Amino acid sequence: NQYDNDVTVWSPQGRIHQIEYAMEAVKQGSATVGLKSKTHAVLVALKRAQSELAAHQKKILHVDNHIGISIAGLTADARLLCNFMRQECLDSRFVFDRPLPVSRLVSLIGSKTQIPTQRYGRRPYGVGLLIAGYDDMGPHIFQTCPSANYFDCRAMSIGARSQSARTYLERHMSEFMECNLDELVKHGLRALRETLPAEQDLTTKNVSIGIVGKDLEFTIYDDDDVSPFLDGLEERPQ
Amino acid sequence: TTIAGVVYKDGIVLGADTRATEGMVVADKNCSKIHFISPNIYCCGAGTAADTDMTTQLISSNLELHSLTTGRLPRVVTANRMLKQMLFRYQGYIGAALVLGGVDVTGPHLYSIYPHGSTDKLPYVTMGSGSLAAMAVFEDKFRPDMEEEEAKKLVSEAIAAGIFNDLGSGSNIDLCVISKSKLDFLRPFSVPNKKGTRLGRYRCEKGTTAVLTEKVTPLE
Amino acid sequence: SRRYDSRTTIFSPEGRLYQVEYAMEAIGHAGTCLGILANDGVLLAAERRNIHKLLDEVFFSEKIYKLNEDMACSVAGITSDANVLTNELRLIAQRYLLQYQEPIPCEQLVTALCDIKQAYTQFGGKRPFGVSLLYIGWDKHYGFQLYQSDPSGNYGGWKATCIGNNSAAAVSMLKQDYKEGEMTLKSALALAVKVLNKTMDVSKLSAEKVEIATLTRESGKTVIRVLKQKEVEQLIKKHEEEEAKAER
Amino acid sequence: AKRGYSFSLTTFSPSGKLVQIEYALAAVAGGAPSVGIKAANGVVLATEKKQKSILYDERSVHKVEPITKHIGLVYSGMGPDYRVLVHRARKLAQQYYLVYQEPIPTAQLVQRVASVMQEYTQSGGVRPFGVSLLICGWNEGRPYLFQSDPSGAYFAWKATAMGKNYVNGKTFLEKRYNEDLELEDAIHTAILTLKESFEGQMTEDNIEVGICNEAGFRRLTPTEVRDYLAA
Amino acid sequence: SSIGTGYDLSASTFSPDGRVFQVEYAMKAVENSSTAIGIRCKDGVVFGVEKLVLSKLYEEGSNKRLFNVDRHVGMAVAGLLADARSLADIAREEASNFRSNFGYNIPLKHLADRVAMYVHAYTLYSAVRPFGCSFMLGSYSANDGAQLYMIDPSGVSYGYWGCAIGKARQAAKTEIEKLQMKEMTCRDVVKEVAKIIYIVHDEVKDKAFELELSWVGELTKGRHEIVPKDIREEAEKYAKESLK
Amino acid sequence: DRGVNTFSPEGRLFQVEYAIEAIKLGSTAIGIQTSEGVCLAVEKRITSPLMEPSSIEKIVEIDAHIGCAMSGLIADAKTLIDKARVETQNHWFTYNETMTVESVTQAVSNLALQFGEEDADPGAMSRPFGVALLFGGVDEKGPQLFHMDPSGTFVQCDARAIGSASEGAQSSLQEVYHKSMTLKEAIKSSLIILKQVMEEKLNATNIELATVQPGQNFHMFTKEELEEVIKDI
Amino acid sequence: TTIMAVQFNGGVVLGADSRTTTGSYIANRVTDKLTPIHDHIFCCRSGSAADTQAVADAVTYQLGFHSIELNEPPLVHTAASLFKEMCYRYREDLMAGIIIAGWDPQEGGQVYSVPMGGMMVRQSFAIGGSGSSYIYGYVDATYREGMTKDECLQFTANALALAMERDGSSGGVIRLAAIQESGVERQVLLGDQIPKFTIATL
Amino acid sequence: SRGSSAGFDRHITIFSPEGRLYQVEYAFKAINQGGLTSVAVRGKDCAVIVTQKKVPDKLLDSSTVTHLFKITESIGCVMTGMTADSRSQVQRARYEAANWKYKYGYEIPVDMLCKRIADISQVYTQNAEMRPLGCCMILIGIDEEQGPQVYKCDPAGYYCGFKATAAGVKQTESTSFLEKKVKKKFDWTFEQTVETAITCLSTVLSIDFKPSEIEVGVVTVENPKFRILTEAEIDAHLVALAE
Numbered sequence A: 001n002q003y004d005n006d007v008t009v010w011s012p013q014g015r016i017h018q019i020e021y022a023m024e025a026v027k028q029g030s031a032t033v034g035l036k037s038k039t040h041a042v043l044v045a046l047k048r049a050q051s052e053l054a055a056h057q058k059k060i061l062h063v064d065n066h067i068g069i070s071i072a073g074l075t076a077d078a079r080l081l082c083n084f085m086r087q088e089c090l091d092s093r094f095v096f097d098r099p100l101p102v103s104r105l106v107s108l109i110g111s112k113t114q115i116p117t118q119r120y121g122r123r124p125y126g127v128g129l130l131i132a133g134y135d136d137m138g139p140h141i142f143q144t145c146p147s148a149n150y151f152d153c154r155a156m157s158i159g160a161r162s163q164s165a166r167t168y169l170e171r172h173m174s175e176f177m178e179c180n181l182d183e184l185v186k187h188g189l190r191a192l193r194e195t196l197p198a199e200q201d202l203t204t205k206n207v208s209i210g211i212v213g214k215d216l217e218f219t220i221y222d223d224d225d226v227s228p229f230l231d232g233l234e235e236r237p238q
Numbered sequence B: 001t002t003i004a005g006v007v008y009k010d011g012i013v014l015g016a017d018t019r020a021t022e023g024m025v026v027a028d029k030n031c032s033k034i035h036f037i038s039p040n041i042y043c044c045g046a047g048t049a050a051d052t053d054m055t056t057q058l059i060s061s062n063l064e065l066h067s068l069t070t071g072r073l074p075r076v077v078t079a080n081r082m083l084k085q086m087l088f089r090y091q092g093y094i095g096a097a098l099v100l101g102g103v104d105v106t107g108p109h110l111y112s113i114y115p116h117g118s119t120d121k122l123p124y125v126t127m128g129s130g131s132l133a134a135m136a137v138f139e140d141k142f143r144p145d146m147e148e149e150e151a152k153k154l155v156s157e158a159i160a161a162g163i164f165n166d167l168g169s170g171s172n173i174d175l176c177v178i179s180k181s182k183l184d185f186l187r188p189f190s191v192p193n194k195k196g197t198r199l200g201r202y203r204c205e206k207g208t209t210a211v212l213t214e215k216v217t218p219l220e
Numbered sequence C: 001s002r003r004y005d006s007r008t009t010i011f012s013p014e015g016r017l018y019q020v021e022y023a024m025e026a027i028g029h030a031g032t033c034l035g036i037l038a039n040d041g042v043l044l045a046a047e048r049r050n051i052h053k054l055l056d057e058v059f060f061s062e063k064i065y066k067l068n069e070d071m072a073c074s075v076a077g078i079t080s081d082a083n084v085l086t087n088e089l090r091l092i093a094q095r096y097l098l099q100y101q102e103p104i105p106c107e108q109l110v111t112a113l114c115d116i117k118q119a120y121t122q123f124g125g126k127r128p129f130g131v132s133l134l135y136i137g138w139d140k141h142y143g144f145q146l147y148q149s150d151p152s153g154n155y156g157g158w159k160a161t162c163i164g165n166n167s168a169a170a171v172s173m174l175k176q177d178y179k180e181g182e183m184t185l186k187s188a189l190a191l192a193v194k195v196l197n198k199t200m201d202v203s204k205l206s207a208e209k210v211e212i213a214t215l216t217r218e219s220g221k222t223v224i225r226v227l228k229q230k231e232v233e234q235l236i237k238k239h240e241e242e243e244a245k246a247e248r
Numbered sequence D: 001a002k003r004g005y006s007f008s009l010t011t012f013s014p015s016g017k018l019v020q021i022e023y024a025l026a027a028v029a030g031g032a033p034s035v036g037i038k039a040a041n042g043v044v045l046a047t048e049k050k051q052k053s054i055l056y057d058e059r060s061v062h063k064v065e066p067i068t069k070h071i072g073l074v075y076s077g078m079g080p081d082y083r084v085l086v087h088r089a090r091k092l093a094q095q096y097y098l099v100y101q102e103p104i105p106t107a108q109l110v111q112r113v114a115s116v117m118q119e120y121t122q123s124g125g126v127r128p129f130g131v132s133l134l135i136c137g138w139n140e141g142r143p144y145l146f147q148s149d150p151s152g153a154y155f156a157w158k159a160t161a162m163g164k165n166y167v168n169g170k171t172f173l174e175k176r177y178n179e180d181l182e183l184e185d186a187i188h189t190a191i192l193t194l195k196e197s198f199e200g201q202m203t204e205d206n207i208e209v210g211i212c213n214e215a216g217f218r219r220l221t222p223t224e225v226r227d228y229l230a231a
Numbered sequence E: 001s002s003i004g005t006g007y008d009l010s011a012s013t014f015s016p017d018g019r020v021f022q023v024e025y026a027m028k029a030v031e032n033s034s035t036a037i038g039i040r041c042k043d044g045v046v047f048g049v050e051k052l053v054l055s056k057l058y059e060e061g062s063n064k065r066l067f068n069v070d071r072h073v074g075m076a077v078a079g080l081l082a083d084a085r086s087l088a089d090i091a092r093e094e095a096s097n098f099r100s101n102f103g104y105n106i107p108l109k110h111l112a113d114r115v116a117m118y119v120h121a122y123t124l125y126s127a128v129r130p131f132g133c134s135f136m137l138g139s140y141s142a143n144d145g146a147q148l149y150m151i152d153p154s155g156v157s158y159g160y161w162g163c164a165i166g167k168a169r170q171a172a173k174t175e176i177e178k179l180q181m182k183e184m185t186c187r188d189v190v191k192e193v194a195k196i197i198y199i200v201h202d203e204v205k206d207k208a209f210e211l212e213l214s215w216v217g218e219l220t221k222g223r224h225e226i227v228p229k230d231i232r233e234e235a236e237k238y239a240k241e242s243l244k
Numbered sequence F: 001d002r003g004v005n006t007f008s009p010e011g012r013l014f015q016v017e018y019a020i021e022a023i024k025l026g027s028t029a030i031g032i033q034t035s036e037g038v039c040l041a042v043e044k045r046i047t048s049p050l051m052e053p054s055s056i057e058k059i060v061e062i063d064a065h066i067g068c069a070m071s072g073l074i075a076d077a078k079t080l081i082d083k084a085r086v087e088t089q090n091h092w093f094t095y096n097e098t099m100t101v102e103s104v105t106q107a108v109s110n111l112a113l114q115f116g117e118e119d120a121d122p123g124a125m126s127r128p129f130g131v132a133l134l135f136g137g138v139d140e141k142g143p144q145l146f147h148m149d150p151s152g153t154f155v156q157c158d159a160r161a162i163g164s165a166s167e168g169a170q171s172s173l174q175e176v177y178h179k180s181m182t183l184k185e186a187i188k189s190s191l192i193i194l195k196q197v198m199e200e201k202l203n204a205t206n207i208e209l210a211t212v213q214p215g216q217n218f219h220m221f222t223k224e225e226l227e228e229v230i231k232d233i
Numbered sequence G: 001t002t003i004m005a006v007q008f009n010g011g012v013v014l015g016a017d018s019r020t021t022t023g024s025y026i027a028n029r030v031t032d033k034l035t036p037i038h039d040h041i042f043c044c045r046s047g048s049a050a051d052t053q054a055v056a057d058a059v060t061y062q063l064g065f066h067s068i069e070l071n072e073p074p075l076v077h078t079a080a081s082l083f084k085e086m087c088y089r090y091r092e093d094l095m096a097g098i099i100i101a102g103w104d105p106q107e108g109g110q111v112y113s114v115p116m117g118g119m120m121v122r123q124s125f126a127i128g129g130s131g132s133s134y135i136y137g138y139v140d141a142t143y144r145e146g147m148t149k150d151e152c153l154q155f156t157a158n159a160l161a162l163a164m165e166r167d168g169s170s171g172g173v174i175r176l177a178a179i180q181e182s183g184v185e186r187q188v189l190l191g192d193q194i195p196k197f198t199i200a201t202l
Numbered sequence H: 001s002r003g004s005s006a007g008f009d010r011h012i013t014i015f016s017p018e019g020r021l022y023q024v025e026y027a028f029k030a031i032n033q034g035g036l037t038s039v040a041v042r043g044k045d046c047a048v049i050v051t052q053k054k055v056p057d058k059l060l061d062s063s064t065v066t067h068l069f070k071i072t073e074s075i076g077c078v079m080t081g082m083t084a085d086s087r088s089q090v091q092r093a094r095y096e097a098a099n100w101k102y103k104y105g106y107e108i109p110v111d112m113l114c115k116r117i118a119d120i121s122q123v124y125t126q127n128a129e130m131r132p133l134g135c136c137m138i139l140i141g142i143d144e145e146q147g148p149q150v151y152k153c154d155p156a157g158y159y160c161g162f163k164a165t166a167a168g169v170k171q172t173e174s175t176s177f178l179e180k181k182v183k184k185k186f187d188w189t190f191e192q193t194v195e196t197a198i199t200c201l202s203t204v205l206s207i208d209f210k211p212s213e214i215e216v217g218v219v220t221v222e223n224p225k226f227r228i229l230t231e232a233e234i235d236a237h238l239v240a241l242a243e
């Protein structure tokens, strides 16, 4: 109760509350899913309407021709971090004329996100990202936290009620690799479906899809672009 | 200038002329070229006069600060290092050619320091525009471990050769003798040059200059 | 870090500045320091706190500082803080002389320091200068002048004022005797002794305990003079003759 | 990884007192007693250097320090703080000599040192010095004795005492001080003022004393202290 | 260890009994994390780490607690993984600066001293907090032999024959004291490192775990390498067989 | 007492949360996005008849195609509006084109969390901005309306209300607003809803109205222009 | 100047002349151009007297601290690397032709050349300075693989004497230094001691 | 009044009502956290340092466990207190010593090196941003002018020369042992000095040391080089004490 004001204060339990409270912002944000195959990496995101008369808030952002991100938490911290990711990618192509390897970018985030968690009067980045990428080592799904820790994932979901989406991905993780692009997206939004309360389901309004892979560069599908994937709505049982 | 130094049996003798020049005209007939560094170390200076004065005063100041902290008598190596590292840092733009000499707990030490920051440690050194003339005397007459009076004669003869041969040098010969227990700062050691007596009278008498305005201001 | 910060440049809920006000309490402990403006000149008269038998007396003064060729000041508050401000005042006065080749006018010198003192109340997070100053001077714009400074950075011109110990009781005592437009340095000094004698804790009042300086105009140039031992002794015993005369 | 606080650690209390300065004054009051006496012929500075163990080497550290060839210093309170003020005063004396080619006047040095002491009462992230200084000097054919306290205020003294039992020390001095005593006598009364606030009996290695006159400032040798100590 | 009306809020503040609690709480962070060990053999150093999997959705190789600091230096971490990675970056940079200045591979004892000085610098101020990470450094040279060091949150550096950091550090050290490492070959050590980890691992309280192994020695030509899958899988087979 | 960058146990920044509370004290503002253009309305809330109503400007133009309505601590918006104006002109200078409504909104939104204590510049922001902004403009993607809050979150709205009475105004828009209504209906609807929630009686002086449309530039409604729409009781 | 260093089995042999010139005047006819940096590490200085001296003094400081901190007898390569860094970074400001030669318990006797550019190369023998020009032919004709310590001393003394004979900016006295495991031993050659190769004409 | 506190005078380096600095006083108790004791004795032509060497287990490489440090070729020290703080102070001492020789042309005196460290320690005692170093340094060396020197500097910034000293847990008990021994007029030979150092640490802990339980560092007139004894040579002195 007196250790939770700064990042520089260790608690008697060996914990830092400011880093832990920053992680709460990821939970408070809207749920998103990310999964990969042997060729494609797909991000599916659930958009939120602030007061269903305003448009559903943006969730998937461009980083490079081969990297795209899904956000959860503070939007302003998400854009700030995205600009960093965009900058490091542009730097790589300027100097080496080759795409920056996903893993290397993620570890650059791990160093940048650490710096503030150790200086007085600073705060952690109140945003968790799901990075989808494709390079020489194939498709990638990465997760970043307010704690500068990052994870290499077979499949991942973060946000509100993401636990139910995580358990679906747990069940169907043995099918993701040999499976095709059209089936991957279906598995992705079927996990995102599980987060929603039993009343409301997926629509052209509240779903965003980001895809990057072998043949195609990172593309965002939003409104009318998302309907080919919804066409094939398996319907929800419980 | 002509400045020179010698290491003898008991310590160090330092010598210098007293001529300062601006252009090809003598500015000062009697200027002090042997400078105080510490009660046991003195330094001769040649080249840019103002550079000579300020460089020699700064290091003297810095050594006093050093010797107060240590409580010990300062070393000639410290004087050497301080002068060397400064003159180098200024890439030779401080035009100070120096003859450094003193007596330590280590013994008698003599240095020549160049404007660019190069040092030499030698039994006899000469600097200045009259250095060649002074160095000639040393090469011809210097002997190892000579007596104080003999070393006084040698250095003075070297300075004399610089005076009577280098147009940049003239007037009085100054000496500084430093040993393990004594220091002699002999200001006018020799006066080999004097102005001829004015046997013609040109004293301008009272009322020979026309005045236009006069104001007298009284004081305390 | 913010735990150890005492926030010196912050606002009170009332709408005031605590550190300034607390600095003002410090001035009320320093020696009684007063100055009054006359027609033929202007003077400063201060209570000396350095009154110990074993003191040496090296300087011409204790609390009277000379700032300019035409200006002088006295101090009430923390002595060390005063030495900072008075040195700065000398610098400000010289910068003006460097720039315009004329002496700095009394207001311009006061305001310059006051802007520095104000800065310490608004930003920086540091304690204010615990000093109030009285300024006496002459310029070709307003002639003989008397000014007053606060830790807040506030300034004011006065015909007669007092700062320091028993400030309130001395001002009402000044209101009683001061006559605007008809005041002379002769009577000004008499008033100065009158106020200090009553306001000070010592009821005898020796020359050792007071310090008086006068700023006059002698044939073109300005004369700042700190009064000698016997000159003060003469003014004090003259006041006693007027005190014993009060048997009417 | 280092930074530095910008806010003052010394502030005005509700009663208008700078608490940290008065607490630093309590620090000097608990320190070893020291005495200074002007003698219209010279100045004497003498201080208690009561060691503790004899294992300590008496000649290793000094409480009486020379600032320059004509100025000396003694303190009461904290050793480490004093040493900082010594190096700072020595630098200030050298700054003056580089510019004017003339030994710094004692009054001019004290003012410059007091300013540094003043800085540590208003500057950010620092505490004041827990030291009062006794500065002696000889310039313009006159002896000088000054005191500089934690706040940065300075005073000219004929004779004064500071440290432990300074109140009794001063009362002892005003009864004993003559404004016409020579240096030899001044040194005698200086040791006597220390004797009043000592307990344990004095040796030449038990106290430290320095003198200042027309010949300059120097520390008195243990042989010279012993000779005066035949009370 | 109690009083905390201040004292324990800043690393620039001592407790009345002369302790810096912020460093001690930083040490608590490494005490809560899973165990990591390293053993100095006759011809090199072997590292072993119990990597707890939070979710089966993470790829095998994620949250790697083994690092390559230099081509000849290995690093095993325990505690807060964020700090661990940034300390690895510092170690990387210190090692490369040495090569760029002096032309050869940085000696481990010098690298360990340099990094520990950096660690220590974070224990002195209120502006920064100490690292919640203990790390081990291993290297092998033909001229220097096998070398193993460990640095804790305080900045203390010591050479080890065997060392354990993490949740069951005291429990692990009792198992390493049973081994004659000075006479052992680093091929045999891998087997023994795996065994100690499996023993120390809590089967019921903690979930499943992945075993990470690396080595540097004569067998690996002085280069720090990850232990090959075929040798790692052999040691896991052996470690489970020890659980009779 | 804590720093300005301190997270609450819920995962929000105290100063940012309290900055949102400041809007709830500001005068209410309505923006409606239609096919024919964008209209912005705001109450002036005059406290004295001696105060000039023409000097209270809560709707300002950023460029010819972009207008902005503001609510909350008006003084704070000075910088945000100025930065938006500089961004539009810098873009023209470099790219010879007008900035999109989204681009401007995003540029301003980047400044929202640019506050802090330690590790700061010689003039960095000490706290969030206590204002909410409504960006109404027209570009290639037709006419759009964007809403920014102190947190930095910007989003397109069909119709949005910000201010002290944004509670009843938002629910009132969800009744009247049809996604194919005209601009005349939009202006009519907004002024009706504005007078429903205002404490003072609505007239042609205590309110401000502006429209941007694909046909013509940002237009500020004068007294006479207002009288024309106010007349509908 | 002329400077020279030859590597043998158990260490190195260093040699230099003693002339310092300020134009066409010998400012110092007996100069110690062999500068000690550590116990077993020496350097030969040619070029600017002030420049080389300052670098030498900085390497001594840098290597001094490095050795204590590393707790090893310093590597000759390391001392040569400290010279390289300085001679390369400030190559436009300095006029320094350095030869670093010494002994260490790891690699034995070593001779490194750092010319004016700031490059570094290990050599069996190295020569530098203005006078080294006149002795390239002799040094290439005389040098033999695996010379003993006493032969290397003769080899350096001969080469230098020939160089001082022809070069105006070289002369005075030959200074020799031998460094091996046991330590450093110094000798000086005066007048008669300098190998006489008689004036060879009609 | 004794034991009084005002504001944050027990958290940062600001004065207490008595005029004390509690944070510095707490830094002295931080020296005793190591649990080790160091003793230094000065002889007629030598200077001896001795410390406890507590290696708890087989797993620690005992060659790395040390509190003896070389600063210069002629100056060595013993560190008592927090280990990480100690290392830092040594690296700074090494820096100042090398910088001195480079600037002044001669090697730094033991006298002057101790002063410099104590001056640096003063900065931490006046600034609130950082804690003082919870450690104590005892330097030894042969001064080329004065002879053997033993100097010690505090976290408070006090420094002094000594005939003999101690630091750590059993400091005040072993300085009391050294007082008695120094008052007795011995012939302070190398043998006498080394043995007085050992027996001081031996009787103050009641242990009777094995060669692996203590570390000894010496400096002599015949060899000014700072030297660490090794177990073989320590044991030689230990077997000689069987009298």
Ligand SMILES: *[C@@](C)(CO)[C@](*)(O)[C@H](Cc1ccccc1)NC(=O)[C@H](Cc1ccc(OC)cc1)NC(=O)[C@H](C)NC(=O)CN1CCOCC1
Residues within 6 Å of the ligand: B001, B002, B019, B020, B021, B022, B023, B027, B031, B032, B033, B045, B046, B047, B048, B049, B050, B052, B053, B095, B128, B129, B167, B168, B169
């Ligand atoms: C002999 C006399 C030179 O022939 C000595 O070197 C002497 C040194 C000396 C003299 C008096 C006090 C202390 C030491 N040098 C001079 O007398 C010197 C000669 C000189 C002139 C110009 C130079 O060009 C850079 C270098 C040396 N005289 C002066 O310094 C005179 C008084 N001042 C000037 O000429 C002004 N200069 C200074 C340099 O910048 C250009 C203007």
Ligand SMILES: *[C@@](C)(CO)[C@](*)(O)[C@H](Cc1ccccc1)NC(=O)[C@H](Cc1ccc(OC)cc1)NC(=O)[C@H](C)NC(=O)CN1CCOCC1
Residues within 6 Å of the ligand: B114, B116, B118, G001, G002, G019, G020, G021, G022, G023, G027, G031, G032, G033, G045, G046, G047, G048, G049, G050, G052, G095, G129, G130, G169, G170
């Ligand atoms: C031989 C003699 C000539 O090449 C050597 O290289 C020798 C190197 C040496 C000298 C002393 C101690 C160790 C090693 N070089 C010199 O004697 C040198 C010649 C030189 C002058 C200027 C240069 O340009 C930067 C390079 C080489 N002489 C000096 O350094 C003398 C002491 N100083 C001057 O000549 C003064 N110069 C400096 C440069 O500007 C013109 C005036």
